[PDB]
C-alpha cells in the first residue's frame, strides 16, 4: 500500500542492509525464517499465501563474499534467493570498473528484479538506495543503477543514503577519486541524498555510547535506526504524519542542493539510560548539537536552511513546539534569511525498538533530525582538494582509464563539484 523498495549496493550497502533488515524484522515481529506468529509490514515486506513474508529488498554486489554471508546466515530463508545477487569479480575500488565494465550485466539483472518487485507494489513511495561513496561497487554500480532508475521509473522518490569518505581518516587511497566521480553522477539523479561519515559515527559511538572500540556492525545499527525512524510514519500512525514525498517538498529548496545531514538522538547505552529525563527539549538540543551529527561537518560554519524533525514514541506536539521554539530562540543556531520557517516537525506514536545484542538502550523517545544546510559544502571542499592534489600529476588515473574513462570525465566531475561549491556559496550569501 505504502511500499518502499530497498536497494543495498556494495559491501557497505549490504552491511547496513543486514542491520536494517534485522531492525525491520524485530519491529514487525517477523521471525528470521520468514513468517510471524494490521498490514504494518506492507512497507517493507510482502506476505505470501503461505504466510511467509519476503522483504522488498535487493542485495546488489559484484563481490560474492558479502552476499554469501547473508546466504549462509540466519536470514537465509527470509530474503528471496534470487534477490540476493552476486557478481564474479569485485570492482576493486575502481569507479570505472563498477560503472563501465563489470556493472553492465549486473545492473541489467538488478533492473529486471527491481521491475518485478515494483510490479508487486500497489503504491510506491520510492526507493531506498544504500551505498558507500568511495568504492567501485558502491560508486560505479550505484551510479549506473540510479541513472537507469531515473530514466525508466521517472518521478519516484529515490533516497540515497550515501556514506562519504571521512575528512582525515579513511580506508582506501583512491577514495577521493571515486567519491568525486560518484558525487558528479548522483548530483542529478537522487532526490534526497543523505551524507554519512564513518568518522562522525565513530565519534558518536565513542562519546555517547562510550564504545571505545566501535565496529562496522555498530555503525550500520545506528544507520538502520536512522532509516527506521525516517520511515516510521510510513508504517505507524501518529500525530503529524510526514511522508517520503513530503521530505523533498519540505527539505529540498533547489534541486541541485539535496544533500542532508542526519542526526539521531538519544544515543545511550543501558548503563547511562534511565539516568536522565530525556525530555523532548533535551533530546532536540542533543540532536542539534554539532557532535551528534553523523557527518564531519560543523553546522556552526554554515547556516541551516531546512530541518525536518522525526520524533518517535511518547512525544506531544506542545512539547515539540516548545523545543523548536527554544531552538529558534537560541543564538548559536542560524537559519538563512530567506527561510523563516525552516522546520518540518513530525511525530509518531511507535517508539523505536531495541535490537538485542546492540548497545542502544530502550528509550521511550527518539529524534531523527535531517537537515539541509549550506555548511555541508565543507565536505565537498575537502574532497575537491584531495581529488585535484592527486589529479594534477594524475596518480592512479591509469587504473580508472583502463576501465573506460578519460581525463575528460575526471575534469567534468571536478568542475561539477566546483559548481556545487559556488552553488552552496550562492545559497549561503545574501
Amino acid at each position: 500500500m505504502r511500499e518502499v523498495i530497498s536497494i543495498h549496493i556494495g559491501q557497505a550497502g549490504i552491511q547496513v542492509g543486514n542491520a536494517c533488515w534485522e531492525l525491520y524484522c524485530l519491529e514487525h515481529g517477523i521471525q528470521p525464517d520468514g513468517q510471524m506468529p494490521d498490514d504494518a509490514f506492507n512497507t517493507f515486506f510482502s506476505e505470501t499465501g503461505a504466510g511467509k513474508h519476503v522483504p522488498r529488498c535487493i542485495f546488489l554486489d559484484l563481490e560474492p563474499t558479502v552476499v554469501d554471508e547473508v546466504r549462509t546466515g540466519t536470514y537465509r530463508q527470509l530474503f528471496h534467493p534470487e534477490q540476493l545477487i552476486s557478481g564474479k569479480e569485485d570492482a576493486a575500488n575502481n569507479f570505472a570498473r563498477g560503472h563501465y565494465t563489470i556493472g553492465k550485466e549486473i545492473v541489467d539483472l538488478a533492473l529486471d528484479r527491481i521491475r518485478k518487485l515494483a510490479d508487486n507494489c500497489t503504491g510506491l513511495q520510492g526507493f531506498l538506495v544504500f551505498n558507500a561513496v568511495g568504492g567501485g561497487t558502491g560508486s560505479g554500480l550505484g551510479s549506473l543503477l540510479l541513472e537507469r532508475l531515473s530514466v525508466d521509473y521517472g518521478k519516484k522518490s529515490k533516497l540515497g543514503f550515501t556514506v562519504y569518505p571521512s575528512p582525515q581518516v579513511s580506508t582506501a587511497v583512491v577514495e577521493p577519486y571515486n567519491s568525486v566521480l560518484s558525487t558528479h553522477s548522483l548530483l542529478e539523479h537522487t532526490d534526497v541524498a543523505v551524507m554519512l561519515d564513518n568518522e562522525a559515527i565513530y565519534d558518536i559511538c565513542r562519546r555517547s555510547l562510550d564504545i571505545e572500540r566501535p565496529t562496522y556492525t555498530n555503525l550500520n545499527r545506528l544507520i538502520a535506526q536512522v532509516i527506521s525512524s525516517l520511515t516510521a510514519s510510513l508504517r505507524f500512525d501518529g500525530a503529524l504524519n510526514v511522508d517520503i514525498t513530503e521530505f523533498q517538498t519540505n527539505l529540498v529548496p533547489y534541486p541541485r542542493i539535496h544533500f542532508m545531514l542526519s542526526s539521531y538522538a538519544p544515543i545511550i547505552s543501558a548503563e547511562k539510560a534511565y539516568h536522565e529525563q530525556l525530555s523532548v527539549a533535551e533530546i532536540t538540543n542533543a540532536a542539534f548539537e554539532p557532535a551528534s551529527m553523523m557527518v564531519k561537518c560543523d553546522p556552526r560554519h554554515g547556516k541551516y536552511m531546512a530541518c525536518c524533525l522525526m520524533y518517535r514514541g511518547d512525544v506531544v506536539p506542545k512539547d515539540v513546539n516548545a523545543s523548536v521554539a527554544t531552538i529558534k530562540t537560541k543564538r548559536t543556531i542560524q537559519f538563512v534569511d530567506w527561510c523563516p520557517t525552516g522546520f518540518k516537525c513530525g511525530i509518531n506514536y511507535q517508539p523505536p525498538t531495541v535490537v538485542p545484542g546492540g548497545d542502544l538502550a530502550k528509550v521511550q523517545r527518539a529524534v531523527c533530525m535531517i537537515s539541509n544546510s549550506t555548511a555541508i559544502g565543507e565536505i565537498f571542499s575537502r574532497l575537491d582538494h584531495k581529488f585535484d592534489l592527486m589529479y594534477a600529476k594524475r596518480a592512479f588515473v591509469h587504473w580508472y582509464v583502463g576501465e573506460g574513462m578519460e581525463e575528460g570525465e575526471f575534469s567534468e566531475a571536478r568542475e561539477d563539484l566546483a559548481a556545487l561549491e559556488k552553488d552552496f556559496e550562492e545559497v549561503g550569501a545574501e
Binding site: 500512525d237 506531544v316 506542545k318 530567506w338 523563516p340 522546520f343 518540518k344
Partner: protein, 431 residues
C-alpha cells in the same frame, strides 16, 4: 429542514471533522452504531440538519471525507465514531500530496475532484432545503488546502446562492509545522477570498495558548484542539438545530457580520472554557461569559484584537437566559471598549440566543468577531511569503506541477490588497 453538508479535507481537516462528528453525535445522543440513545424529543427534532435516517433507526452523518492518502481516513474509520460515516463518502487518492498546494489543486486533486463533486452532488440533491456547506481543513497543507480550495471553487460554481462556511487552520505565527506553509497559505487565501462566503481563521498556537492558559491542561494533544474547534463548529449552528428565543441561522450571521464581501475572515472563540481546578470555583453568569468572550486570550486566532478594530462581532448564546442580560452586557462591552470598535457602525454586535445549551453546560456562548486585527496575521504570512519568493525557494516543486510563476505574484497582490483593505477600515474616520 435547513440542511448542512459537511466536508473534511486533508489530515488536519479529517481529524477535525471526525472530532466534530463525535461531538455532534454526543450532543444529539447518537451512539457510534447510529442508533439514537438520547431520550429527548428536541435532539431528534432537527436531526435532519446533520444526519439522514437509514432503513433502520441508524442515523448517518451528511459528511464527505477527502484525502489523497488513505492512511488518515483509515485512522478515522478506526476511530470511535468511524463507522457512522457513509462508506461511499470516503474519497481517497492513492499518493498523498507532499504538502504541495500545486499537487493538491492541479495535478493530483484534479482526478479526485470529479468523484468528490459526484458524492457532494449526491448528498446535496437529497437535501430538501440546503443551508449550505461547511468545509473543515487547514491552510498550509498540500491535499488539505489544495483540494479544499478546488472543491470550494467547484461548489461555488454549482451553488452560488448556497451558504459556504469554511473552518481553515491558518499556519501558526511563531512555530511553523511545514516549511512551505507560507506558500500554501498565501495560495489558499487567494481562493478563500474569492469563493468562500464565510471563513473561520484558526491557529494551532492560539489553541495551544488557550488550552494551556485557561484550560490549564498538561499534555494537550491534537484531540483536545480538535475538540475545541468542534465545539465552536457546533455552537455556530446550534440555532439551526434547537429552539431559540432569538434564533439566527448561518446566512443571518453572515449578513450581520460581513460589511464588505472580501472581509469575511473571522476569529472565533468558545465560552465558558474553565480549568478543571476552577470549574467549581467559577460562577456561570452571562456577565462572566461575556467577560471571558471579549478577552483576547479566548480567541482561537493568533492575532489579538487589541491591535485592530472590531468591524463586527456576533455572539450566539446557548441556555435559558435573559435577553435583557445579554443585550445589556454586550452594549456595556461596546461602550467600555468603544476605542476598539468601529465608529461608522452604530452597533457592532449581533446577539442571538438559543434555548438548548450543550450537554453538561448550563450556559455557553460562541463568539464570531470580524476585526482588523487579522491584518497582522495576513501581514506575517506575507512577510514569510515574500522572503521565500524573492529567492524562489521550493518554487520548482510548484512550477513542475504546471502552475505559473505569475500565480504566486497574483495571489500575493490579492492578499496584500486584503491587508490594505483591513487597514483602510481600521483607520477610516466617520464623516
Amino acid at each position: 429542514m435547513r440542511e448542512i453538508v459537511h466536508i473534511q479535507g486533508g489530515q488536519c481537516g479529517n481529524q477535525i471533522g471526525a472530532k466534530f462528528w463525535e461531538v455532534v453525535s454526543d450532543e444529539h445522543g447518537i451512539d457510534p452504531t447510529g442508533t439514537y440513545h438520547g431520550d429527548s424529543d428536541l435532539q431528534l427534532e432537527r436531526i435532519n440538519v446533520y444526519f439522514n435516517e437509514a432503513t433502520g433507526g441508524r442515523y448517518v452523518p451528511r459528511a464527505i471525507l477527502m484525502d489523497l492518502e488513505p492512511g488518515t481516513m483509515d485512522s478515522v474509520r478506526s476511530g470511535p465514531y468511524g463507522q457512522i460515516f457513509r462508506p461511499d463518502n470516503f474519497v481517497f487518492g492513492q499518493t498523498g500530496a507532499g504538502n504541495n498546494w500545486a499537487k493538491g489543486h492541479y495535478t493530483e486533486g484534479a482526478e479526485l475532484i470529479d468523484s468528490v463533486l459526484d458524492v457532494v452532488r449526491k448528498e446535496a440533491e437529497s437535501c430538501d432545503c440546503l443551508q449550505g456547506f461547511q468545509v473543515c481543513h487547514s491552510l498550509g497543507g498540500g491535499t488539505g488546502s489544495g483540494m479544499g480550495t478546488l472543491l470550494i471553487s467547484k461548489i461555488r460554481e454549482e451553488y452560488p446562492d448556497r451558504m459556504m462556511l469554511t473552518f481553515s487552520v491558518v499556519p501558526s505565527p511563531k512555530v511553523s509545522d511545514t516549511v512551505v506553509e507560507p506558500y500554501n497559505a498565501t495560495l489558499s487565501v487567494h481562493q478563500l477570498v474569492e469563493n468562500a462566503d464565510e471563513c473561520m481563521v484558526l491557529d494551532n498556537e492560539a489553541l495551544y495558548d488557550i488550552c494551556f492558559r485557561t484550560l490549564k491542561l498538561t499534555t494537550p494533544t491534537f484531540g483536545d484542539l480538535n475538540h475545541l474547534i468542534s465545539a465552536v463548529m457546533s455552537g455556530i449552528t446550534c440555532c439551526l438545530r434547537f429552539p431559540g428565543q432569538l434564533n439566527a441561522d448561518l446566512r443571518k450571521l453572515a449578513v450581520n457580520l460581513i460589511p464588505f464581501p472580501r472581509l469575511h475572515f473571522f476569529m472565533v472563540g468558545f465560552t465558558p472554557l474553565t480549568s478543571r481546578g476552577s470549574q467549581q470555583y467559577r460562577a456561570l453568569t452571562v456577565p462572566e461569559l461575556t467577560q471571558q468572550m471579549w478577552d483576547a486570550k479566548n480567541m482561537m486566532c493568533a492575532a489579538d484584537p487589541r491591535h485592530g478594530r472590531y468591524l463586527t462581532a456576533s455572539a450566539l448564546f446557548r441556555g435559558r437566559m435573559s435577553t435583557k442580560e445579554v443585550d445589556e452586557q454586550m452594549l456595556n462591552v461596546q461602550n467600555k471598549n468603544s476605542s476598539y470598535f468601529v465608529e461608522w457602525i452604530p452597533n457592532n454586535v449581533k446577539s442571538s440566543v438559543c434555548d438548548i445549551p450543550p450537554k453538561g453546560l448550563k450556559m455557553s456562548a460562541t463568539f464570531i468577531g470580524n476585526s482588523t486585527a487579522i491584518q497582522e496575521m495576513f501581514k506575517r504570512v506575507s512577510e514569510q511569503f515574500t522572503a521565500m519568493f524573492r529567492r524562489k525557494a521550493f518554487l520548482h516543486w510548484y512550477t513542475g506541477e504546471g502552475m505559473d510563476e505569475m500565480e504566486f505574484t497574483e495571489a500575493e497582490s490579492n492578499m496584500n490588497d486584503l491587508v490594505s483593505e483591513y487597514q483602510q477600515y481600521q483607520d477610516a474616520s466617520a464623516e
